[PDB]
Amino acid sequence: ANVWGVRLADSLSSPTIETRTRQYTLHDLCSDLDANPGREPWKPLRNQRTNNIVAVQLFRPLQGLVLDTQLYGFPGAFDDWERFMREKLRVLKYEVLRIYPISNYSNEHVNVFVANALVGAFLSNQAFYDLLPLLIINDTMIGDLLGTGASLSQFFQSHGDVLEVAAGRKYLQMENYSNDDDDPPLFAKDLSDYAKAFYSDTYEVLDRFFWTHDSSAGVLVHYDKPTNGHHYLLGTLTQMVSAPPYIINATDAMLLESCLEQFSANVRARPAQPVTRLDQCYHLRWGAQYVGEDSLTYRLGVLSLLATNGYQLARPIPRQLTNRWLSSFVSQIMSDGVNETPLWPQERYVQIAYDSPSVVDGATQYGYVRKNQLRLGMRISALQSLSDTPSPVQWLPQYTIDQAAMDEGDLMVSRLTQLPLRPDYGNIWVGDALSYYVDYNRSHRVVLSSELPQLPDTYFDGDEQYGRSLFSLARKIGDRSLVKDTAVLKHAYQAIDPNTGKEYLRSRQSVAYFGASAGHSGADQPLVIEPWIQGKISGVPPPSSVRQFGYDVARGAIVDLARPFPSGDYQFVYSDVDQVVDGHDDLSISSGLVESLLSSCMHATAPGGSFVVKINFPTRPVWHYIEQKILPNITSYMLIKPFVTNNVELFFVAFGVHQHSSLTWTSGVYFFLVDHFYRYETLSTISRQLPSFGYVDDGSSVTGIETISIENPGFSNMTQAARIGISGLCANVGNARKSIAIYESHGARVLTITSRRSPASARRKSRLRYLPLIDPRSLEVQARTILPADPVLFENVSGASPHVCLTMMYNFEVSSAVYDGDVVLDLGTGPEAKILELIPATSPVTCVDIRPTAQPSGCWNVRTTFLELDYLSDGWITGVRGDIVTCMLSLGAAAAGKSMTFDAAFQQLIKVLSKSTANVVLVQVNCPTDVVRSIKGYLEIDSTNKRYRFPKFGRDEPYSDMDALEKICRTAWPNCSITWVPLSYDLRWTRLALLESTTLSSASIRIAELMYKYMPIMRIDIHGLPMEKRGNFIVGQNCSLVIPGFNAQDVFNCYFNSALAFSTEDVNAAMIPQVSAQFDATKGEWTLDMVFSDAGIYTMQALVGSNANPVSLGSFVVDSPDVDITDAWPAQLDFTIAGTDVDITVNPYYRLMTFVRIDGQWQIANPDKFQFFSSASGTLVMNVKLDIADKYLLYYIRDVQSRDVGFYIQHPLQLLNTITLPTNEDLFLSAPDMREWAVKESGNTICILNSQGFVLPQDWDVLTDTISWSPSIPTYIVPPGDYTLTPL
Amino acid sequence: MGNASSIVQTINVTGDGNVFKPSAETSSTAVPSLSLSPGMLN
């Protein structure tokens, strides 16, 4: 229910059992005066923020202080007050004990009025010797005092047979009290005279008395169990002014205190816990001639009666009340609304409804009347208390069958919204960076300088700059120069010379850093220099010296580096000069600057040296100049691009300068550049559609936040306005995470609802014709507090999991496949019906699922049907309408649930789909499109029993092969076209993540790519063009295609990752090792013979006649060679500098390197320890220098050929960890790690390597160059003996 | 129907004092049909 703005719960509670009373004896009074610790007649009240005692509550006695406070001479602080009170009460006890000895007066009933009056007169310093003879009752408490007369008129006054006594305080203020926001309310009970009490023995006499007495201020009475017998209470004109902005007189304050006590007692009620009184509320009997309907007294009476009948507040009542809480409650009481309850106060008596749980009418004997025809429909149950949630909580809404017009929903959303506001943005890309590189290889074909791609002509547009800046401002990473330099250096130091067999770059060589910058990080130099010198970078041995040059340097020389200047020769040159400063915003001038920088770096380098240059804008003139004036003068080159932000920058590395050669651009460089530009174009298109970094949200941008706020919610009987507003918010952001919060702000209770919108939400919105309303039960149940939180656009702070990326790839493919106005048959849709946001807004959909759906049914605009039945069963496919069929991430789980092989499941699915009317089938399939390998931690493959295991989810599914599925489909549809949708290497699906306020990382993307390698999407086109595969589609082998149904004038062309692999118009101009094409007229067939070089998925297209629209064929998959590797060791080892040579067998296609695992990281072993070369018969030989430390390290062999490392080959060398050290030779020794190790000879310890107090033994010898993975760790030569290292 | 229990209730399905006494003058209809002819409604 709801009453004038006060929300009420939907259940009723009440106390059940009263507690009996004990009378008050002289022993009890003496004990009360004793005031022993823990039993005192007072109790302190503390400020809720500072925690200082600010007031005290007075129990019995000390309920008689009715004079001005300066008359008692009280102290100011709590402790002084305690001491003063104890000392005075002790003397009072002795004075009262002199009259009534405890020996024969210990069990006698004492007059409460006389006790209170005696204490007050003692403390106020007036005569009380007329009070002691009345201490012990003789007939009745009131009868003894009604007859005394005017002698004691200072305390008691008798108007015949009714005794008037002035009400005493129940609270007392200390000096700290300051009307603070956190001080406890005292309800005007701390004043001199807030009220007067009239005691009699019967109610009729009291009514007769009050007939001829004033009653305008209002008369209150307890009916259940009054304190000192029957009495009426009359309020004076004193007021409470501690609850701003309100001023409350005595009557309303007393009513309010009683009402709150009753509500709190209602909430915490048990059937077997006695309470002092079953009804703590006051009733106003005489004086109700002067109550206005809009007054506070009328509504206080309504609340009092409601609390009597068992109602509960929806908000939590604090254990100790404070002024802000009371002010908020009173502000809620006076708001707008009506009393929805069927209970209205009436002067004559109190009403108890028939369904009320209170049993007060049976406890008492006069005052409460039960109404039979008055009924309440409510469950009887007490509230369950909960603590307040510090952050907003999620909320899943559920829709009823109600409907409304969309326009009214938009109007209510406009009314309730809290926009505009400035939120926090967050980061759109977090985590570590990766690198993509290409090198020179002679197995590729020759590419001229005009076939190479160039940067887009619109690179410098205003919105392009906006996109680049937005991407750069919202990516979290460390110093970018350090990352780029580390990647480039680690790539450069491991290139192998062709004719000598060593690395180009070696340790202890001169280095020149051109373009070094101080920077405003306090280092005053490039960061990567410092570790490089100390050898903290594995695989990068330190140089002899480093010299810095540039305009903005701090520890070098300021010089213009494009013109001759005095400087010697250097064996390695690293350039990082940008072409922006000197180049006057003209592109050709920047290209000329690149040329001059290349000439300068060529002159500065000694013959046999090496250099690195950075290019900001790769243009075709630059490629031509490099081709004509540099390449015929170096030995080898490579290109690197460490991806930190969205750029077209590139690094060019030249090895072996000042030497003749015949180097040319190759096809691999063409592929590298094509993908390098495509990735930038896609990411720019995505990131130009995001809001500005630090914008103000008005609701106008497609991507943004939405929020609404409602004051004093009315969930119980929600008016259509609030329900329509909440439904409008739900319609704007559908299928997005939603949060709610309930909190107090400025004397109100407020509900706030927040979510985020997106283009998918707009698409789902455009499909509605009406507005489906929600079920408000979940909100009206809530009876707690949830504190709010700051709004942030990108709430996620870690990056999407690879499973989410795989699902986004599948969803993007589904969205792209469906054109406009095409009937869709979706199989296995979830309850939430994601498909409604992917297909366009004019395409009818039929979702088939075994589980019941959650989406509403009558609000939609076009056909939208949901069916509850398994899709692999027969008897239903004849009667559905569809053309494109979608089944994603459902077939494997369904086949595992029924415990059948994947072949049988696919056969059954194709059987049911044969009888349909579909044209295109899109099925997510469990089948490998490469060699079978396991992704540790995310997917494991069991080949003997074909079985995919998913450890992140603890799930299991079967799988099959391409041959079986292709044979099944070719049997079902004799002329279909099967394609394997290529989603690897493509970044378009990211449009479904960054535009939904979701944060991505690069490593998760790579994991998703590697998982999609084994779970492709098979797309079958029913009426397609048959073609046949003949050879073994393996890298390097001969593979053939047989294509029918074409003439002698037709043209073919193949595509490999958005780059034209080859064509038939110009056969020799291809980028594939060997292609040939023949035509046969009698069979009318095209025969294509090919030899491939790179594994992947290739697509084919055909051009017929003069048509401008090309007809698309299927696609095929080209696989990598075998991954079986082995090693063989000689019988007699070698422990000298020459080392031992082991013969290893592996396919020549792979490039091998050796690594080691340290603290969960991968580190490159030294090139001084392992050397790979070839023998006469071509057998691969590996030369290794055996080390004692190798008894405690495990070395791995991994392939480094492609962008991934270690996915195809990861071979541990076991026989290196199990060598037997000779006892009569000189051995190499080195510290295995950075920990301290103890070296022991025959159990006699020698020294502790890495210890601070380590001194070299006299007979040990040092090695000129180390063989340890860490270049900082030195190598020693140890004499004959057997040694052991223990990791201290 | 069925049997149940509540702490406070208004009617007793399984209790005493209920009447079941079909009559001709009482009968039982809800809304078998309504007249919604196209000629009448315009």
From Swiss-Prot, chain A:
InterPro entries: Ig-like_fold, Reovirus_L2, Reovirus_L2_4th, Reovirus_L2_6th, Reovirus_L2_7th, Reovirus_L2_8th, Reovirus_L2_GTase, Reovirus_L2_MT1. Keywords: ATP-binding, Capsid protein, GTP-binding, Methyltransferase, mRNA capping, mRNA processing, Multifunctional enzyme, Nucleotide-binding, Nucleotidyltransferase, Outer capsid protein, S-adenosyl-L-methionine, Transferase, Virion. It is an enzyme of class 2 (transferase). Changing K196A: 90% loss of autoguanylylation activity. Its main location: virion. Its EC number is 2.7.7.50, 2.1.1.56. It is found in: Virion. Changing K43A: Almost no effect on autoguanylylation activity. GO terms for molecular function: ATP binding; GTP binding; mRNA 5'-cap (guanine-N7-)-methyltransferase activity; mRNA guanylyltransferase activity. Coiled coil: none annotated. It catalyses: a 5'-end diphospho-ribonucleoside in mRNA + GTP + H(+) = a 5'-end (5'-triphosphoguanosine)-ribonucleoside in mRNA + diphosphate; a 5'-end (5'-triphosphoguanosine)-ribonucleoside in mRNA + S-adenosyl-L-methionine = a 5'-end (N(7)-methyl 5'-triphosphoguanosine)-ribonucleoside in mRNA + S-adenosyl-L-homocysteine. ATP binds at G892, A893, A894, A895, A896, G897, K898, S899. GO terms for cellular component: icosahedral viral capsid; viral outer capsid. Pfam families: Reovirus_L2_4th, Reovirus_L2_6th, Reovirus_L2_7th, Reovirus_L2_8th, Reovirus_L2_GTase, Reovirus_L2_MT1, Reovirus_L2_MT2, Reovirus_L2_N. Changing K88A: Almost no effect on autoguanylylation activity. Changing K170A: Almost complete loss of autoguanylylation activity. Changing K225A: No effect on autoguanylylation activity. The record marks K189 as: Involved in formation of the phosphoamide bond. Outer capsid protein involved in mRNA capping. Catalyzes the last 3 enzymatic activities for formation of the 5' cap structure on the viral plus-strand transcripts, namely the RNA guanylyltransferase, RNA-7N- and RNA-2'O-methyltransferase activities. Belongs to the orthoreovirus lambda-2 protein family. Interacts with protein mu-NS; in viral inclusions. This is Outer capsid protein lambda-2. It comes from Reovirus type 3 (strain Dearing).
Swiss-Prot record, chain B:
Coiled coil: none annotated. Glycans are attached at N3, N12. It comes from the Viruses. A lipid is attached at G2 (N-myristoyl glycine). This is Outer capsid protein mu-1N. It comes from Reovirus type 3 (strain Dearing) (T3D). The gene is M2.
